[PDB]
Structures are given as structure tokens and as C-alpha cells.
Design a protein around this ligand. Structure first.
Ligand SMILES: CNc1ccc(-c2nc3ccc(O)cc3s2)cc1
Ligand SMILES: CNc1ccc(-c2nc3ccc(O)cc3s2)cc1
Ligand SMILES: CNc1ccc(-c2nc3ccc(O)cc3s2)cc1
Ligand SMILES: CNc1ccc(-c2nc3ccc(O)cc3s2)cc1
Ligand SMILES: CNc1ccc(-c2nc3ccc(O)cc3s2)cc1
Ligand SMILES: CNc1ccc(-c2nc3ccc(O)cc3s2)cc1
Ligand SMILES: CNc1ccc(-c2nc3ccc(O)cc3s2)cc1
Ligand SMILES: CNc1ccc(-c2nc3ccc(O)cc3s2)cc1
Ligand SMILES: CNc1ccc(-c2nc3ccc(O)cc3s2)cc1
Ligand SMILES: CNc1ccc(-c2nc3ccc(O)cc3s2)cc1
Ligand SMILES: CNc1ccc(-c2nc3ccc(O)cc3s2)cc1
Ligand SMILES: CNc1ccc(-c2nc3ccc(O)cc3s2)cc1
Lengths: 55, 55, 55, 55, 55, 55, 55, 55, 55, 55
């Protein structure tokens, strides 16, 4: 076989899960957050996949 | 087989799940948030997939 | 087989779920949010798939 | 088989769900939000798939 | 076989999970956060995959 | 002060919430159930406060 | 002060929450269930407060 | 002070939370269940407070 | 002071939390369950407070 | 002071937490279970407080 990509690719066979991202956010997984009190200014309480590039 | 992509591709066979994103947000997964009190200015309480690029 | 894409594609066979996004938001998954009080100015309380690019 | 796309495509066979988006928003999944009080100016309380690009 | 990529690629066969990211965040895994009180200004309470590049 | 009860009482001062039950069911709290498929004969899918005394 | 009870009482002062139960079920708390598939005969999927006394 | 109870009592002062139960179930706490697939006959998947006295 | 109980009592002062139970189940605490697949016949997957007295 | 109990009592002063149980189950503490696959017939996967007296 032959393949040429510029990116971003994701090429496969017999594949149970696939995610391609440029951005941006993708949530595909099981996630449970239980929480009782959030205070403070300002605290990232429960972050799973996170990116902060403030300018 | 032969394939040429510019991106972003996601090419496969026999594949249970697929996500392609440029952006942007995609939520495809099970997610449960239970929460009782959020305060503060300003706190990211429960973030799963998150991207902040303020300018 | 042969395939040429510019992107964004999502090409497959025998595939249970598919999402293609450029944007933008796509919500296809099970999601439960239970919440009792949100305060503060301004706090992202419960974000699952999120993108903030304010200019 | 043969396929050439400009994007955004989503090509498949035997496929239970499909979403193609350029935009924009698509909601196809089960979603339950229960909520008791939202205050503050201005707090994104419960966001599932979200994109904010204010200029 | 032959392959030439510019990156970022992810090329495979017989592959159970795949993630390609440029960004950005991708959450595909099981995650449980249980939490009782978050205070302080400002403390990253529970971060799993995290990136902070404030300027 | 003086108090004599037979039960069931609930006596208080300065009290934000109160529930008295003999029975029976009382639901006063925030509750979110999101659900996609229930099968089987017969499975209690999502029970929060539950009592089964079949004879 | 003086108090005589037969039960079940709940006597207090300056008290934020109170529950008295004989039964029976009382749900006063925040609860989020997100769920995607329930099968089997018969499986208690997600039980929070539960009592089964079948005869 | 003086107190005589038969039970079940719960007597206090300056008390943030109170639960009295004879039964029966009481759910007053924050709870998040996220779940993707339940099978089998019959499996208690996610039980928090649970009592099974089948006869 | 003087106190005579038959049980079950719970007598206190200046007390943040109280639970009295005869039964039965009481859930007052923060709880997060995230789960992806449950199979088998029949397996207690995730049990927090649990009592099984089948006859 | 003077006290006579039959049991089960729990008598105190200046006390942050209290639990009295006859039964039965009480869950008052923070608990996080994250889990990916449960199989087998039948295996107690993750048990925190547990009692099995099958007859
Ligand atoms: C995040 N902001 C952003 C803006 C623009 C893009 C673009 N991606 C492509 C790809 C192929 C093409 O012919 C044109 C474009 S423009 C991506 C991201
Ligand atoms: C010292 N370590 C540190 C980590 C994180 C922070 C953050 N500050 C903000 C403010 C607004 C917002 O939406 C998100 C965040 S995160 C600050 C400090
Ligand atoms: C070893 N390096 C490598 C890079 C890329 C490939 C590719 N194979 C295909 C097939 C179909 C298609 O539309 C695109 C592509 S790209 C293969 C191998
Ligand atoms: C952390 N900041 C950062 C900025 C830029 C990069 C880049 N990586 C590549 C790779 C290939 C290419 O043709 C161009 C670039 S630019 C990486 C990181
Ligand atoms: C984090 N900031 C960032 C900005 C830009 C990039 C880019 N990655 C590629 C890859 C191929 C290409 O032809 C162009 C570009 S630009 C990556 C990261
Ligand atoms: C994070 N900010 C960002 C801006 C731009 C990009 C771009 N990626 C590509 C890829 C191919 C192409 O022909 C054009 C572009 S532009 C990526 C990231
Ligand atoms: C030391 N053991 C003890 C047991 C029980 C008590 C009680 N005090 C009160 C007051 C008012 C009321 O309606 C009921 C009761 S019960 C006090 C002490
Ligand atoms: C679980 N089944 C059940 C049946 C009956 C009861 C009763 N509790 C009281 C209390 C005082 C009284 O004068 C009478 C009765 S009867 C409780 C439970
Ligand atoms: C060996 N360990 C074991 C634990 C638990 C069980 C249970 N069997 C049932 C049947 C019906 C129902 O509503 C709940 C349950 S739980 C069986 C065995
Ligand atoms: C486990 N099975 C079980 C059955 C019965 C009990 C009882 N505990 C008390 C206490 C005082 C009283 O006057 C009566 C009774 S009965 C306890 C356990
Ligand atoms: C679990 N099954 C059950 C049946 C009956 C009870 C009873 N509790 C009391 C208390 C005072 C009283 O005068 C009568 C009764 S009966 C409790 C439990
Ligand atoms: C688990 N099964 C069960 C049955 C009965 C009980 C009883 N507890 C009391 C307490 C005081 C009283 O005057 C009567 C009774 S009966 C408890 C448990």
C-alpha cells in the first residue's frame, strides 16, 4: 500500500476508536465528576483535558 | 490501496467510533457531572475537554 | 481501493458512529448535569467540550 | 472502490450514526440538565458542546 | 509498503485506540473525580492532562 | 424549652431544609438522569432513593 | 431544656438540613446519572440509596 | 439538660446536617454516576448505599 | 446533664454531621463512579456501602 | 454527668462527624471509583465497605 499525508491524518484498519483533532476539544470517554463546593478566584477545580494559552 | 490526504483526514475500516475535528468541540462520550455549589470569580469548576486562547 | 481527500474527511466501513466537524459544536453523547447553585462572575461551572477564543 | 472529496465528507457503510457539520451546532445525543439556581454576570453554567469566538 | 508524512500522522493496522492531537485537548479515557471542597486563589485542584502557557 | 414527641417529629430553629416522611417518598433535591437504552426483565436502571418490599 | 421522645425524632437548633424517615425513601441531594446501555435480567445498574426486602 | 429517648433519635445543637432513618433509604449527598454499558444477569453495577435481604 | 437511651441514639453538641440508621441505607457523602463496561453474572462492580443477607 | 444506654448509642460533644448504624449501610465519605472493564462470574471488583452473609 501507499500513503502520503500532510497532517494531521489518522489512518488505520480494524480499529475500535479514532480521534483526530486540531483545535479545540474532543471528549469521547466516560467521565464522572461529583463535587460539593468550589470557591476561590480563580481555581481550576477538576480539569481532565485542558489547555490555557491566554495572551 | 492508495491514499493521499491534505489533512485532517481519518480513514479506516471496521471501526466502531470516529471523530474528526477542526475547531471547535465534539462531545460523543458518556459524561456525568453532579455539583452542589460554584462560587468565585472566575473558577473553571469541572472542565472535561477545554481550550482557552483569549487574546 | 483509492482515495484522495482535501480534508476534513472521515471515510470508513462497518462503523458504528461518525462525527465530522469544522466549527462549531457537535453533541452526540449521553450527558447528565445536575446542579444546585452557580454564582460568581464569571465561572465556567460544568463544561464538557469547550472552546473559547475571544479577541 | 474510488473516492475523491474536497471536504467535509463522511463516507461509510453499515453505519449506525453520522454527523457532518460546518458551522454551527448539531445535537443528536441524549442530554439531561437539572439545575436549581444560576447567578453571576456572566457564567457559563452547564455547557456541553460550546464554541465562543467573540471579536 | 511506502509512507511519507509531514506530521502529525498516526498510521497503523489492527489498532484498538488512536488519538491525534494538535492543540488542544482530547479526553478518551475513563475518569472519576470525587471532591468535597475547593478553596484558595488559585489552586489547580485535580488536573489530569493539563497545559498552561499564559503570556 | 420543653418538648415531648411520639414520633416522627422534626423540630428545629434557623433551618434551611426539612423533610419528614412516613411512607412513602419525598423528592426535594436536584436530580438529572440522562439515559440512552434500558433493556432486560427486569433491571432497576437508575434508582436514587428506593425501597422494595414485595410480599 | 428537657425532651422526651418515642422515636423517631430529630431535634436541633441552627441546623442547615434535616431528614426524618420511616419507610420509605427521601432524596434531597444533588444526583447526576448519565448512562448509555442497560441490559441483563436483572441487574441493578446504578443504585444510590437502596433497600430490597423481597419475601 | 435532660433527655430520654426510645430510639431512634438524633439530638443536637449547631448542626449542619442531620439524617434519621429507619427503613429504607435516604440520599442527601452529591453523587455522580457515569456509565457506558451494563450487561450480565444480574450484576449490581454501581451501588453506593445498598441493602439486600431477599427471603 | 443526664441522658438515658434505648438505642439507637446519636446525641451531641456543636456537630457538623450526623447520621442515624437502622435498616437500610443512608448516603450523605460525595461519590463519583465512572465506568465503561460491566459484564458477568453476577459481579458486584463498584460497591461503596453494601450489605447482602440473602436467605 | 450521667448516662445509661442499651446500645447502640453514640454520645459526644464538640464533634465534627457522627455515624450510628445497625443494618445496613452508611456512606458519608469521599469516594471515587474509575473503572474500565469488569468481567467474570462473579467477582467483587471494587468494594469499599462490604458485608456478605448469604445463607
Ligand atoms: C484555528 N483556526 C484555523 C483557521 C483556518 C484553518 C484552515 N485549515 C485549512 C485546510 C485546508 C485548506 O485548503 C484551507 C484551510 S484553512 C484551520 C484553523
Ligand atoms: C499559579 N498557577 C496558576 C494556574 C492557573 C491559573 C488560572 N487562572 C485563570 C483565570 C481564568 C480562567 O478562566 C482560568 C484560569 S487558570 C492561575 C495560576
Ligand atoms: C508508512 N507510512 C504511511 C503513511 C501514510 C499512509 C496512507 N495510507 C492511506 C490510504 C488511503 C488514504 O485515503 C490515505 C492514506 S495515507 C500509509 C503509510
Ligand atoms: C510549543 N510551540 C510550538 C510551536 C510550533 C511548533 C511546530 N511544529 C512543527 C512541525 C512541523 C512543521 O513543518 C512546522 C512546525 S511548527 C511546535 C511547538
Ligand atoms: C500551538 N500553535 C500552533 C500553531 C501552528 C501549528 C501548525 N502546524 C502545521 C502543520 C502543517 C502545516 O502545513 C502547517 C502548520 S501550522 C501548530 C501549532
Ligand atoms: C492553533 N492555531 C492553528 C492555526 C492554523 C493551523 C493550520 N493547519 C493547516 C494545515 C494544512 C493547511 O494547508 C493549512 C493549515 S493552517 C493550525 C493551528
Ligand atoms: C446524655 N444522653 C442524652 C440522651 C438524650 C438527650 C435528649 N435531650 C432532648 C431534648 C429535647 C427533646 O425533644 C428530646 C431530647 S433527648 C439528652 C442526653
Ligand atoms: C417497616 N415497617 C414498619 C411498620 C410499623 C412501624 C411502626 N412504628 C411505630 C412507632 C410508634 C407507634 O406508636 C406505632 C408504630 S408502628 C414501623 C415500621
Ligand atoms: C455471589 N455474590 C452475589 C452478589 C449479589 C447478587 C445479586 N443477585 C440479585 C438479584 C436481583 C437483584 O435485584 C439484585 C441482586 S444482587 C448475587 C450474588
Ligand atoms: C443483624 N440482625 C439483627 C436483628 C435484630 C437486631 C436488634 N437490635 C436491638 C437492640 C435493642 C432492642 O431493644 C432490640 C433489638 S433487635 C440487631 C441485628
Ligand atoms: C426492619 N423492620 C422493622 C419493623 C419494625 C420496626 C419498629 N420500630 C419501632 C420503634 C418503636 C415502637 O414503639 C415500635 C416499633 S416497630 C423497625 C424495623
Ligand atoms: C434488621 N431487622 C430489624 C428488625 C427489628 C429491629 C428493631 N429495633 C427496635 C428498637 C427498639 C424497639 O422498641 C423495637 C425494635 S425492633 C431492628 C432491625
Amino acid at each position: 500500500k501507499k500513503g502520503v499525508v500532510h497532517g494531521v491524518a489518522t489512518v488505520a484498519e480494524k480499529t475500535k476508536e479514532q480521534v483526530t483533532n486540531v483545535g479545540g476539544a474532543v471528549v469521547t470517554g466516560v467521565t464522572a465528576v461529583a463535587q460539593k463546593t468550589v470557591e476561590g478566584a480563580g481555581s481550576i477545580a477538576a480539569a481532565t483535558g485542558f489547555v490555557k494559552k491566554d495572551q
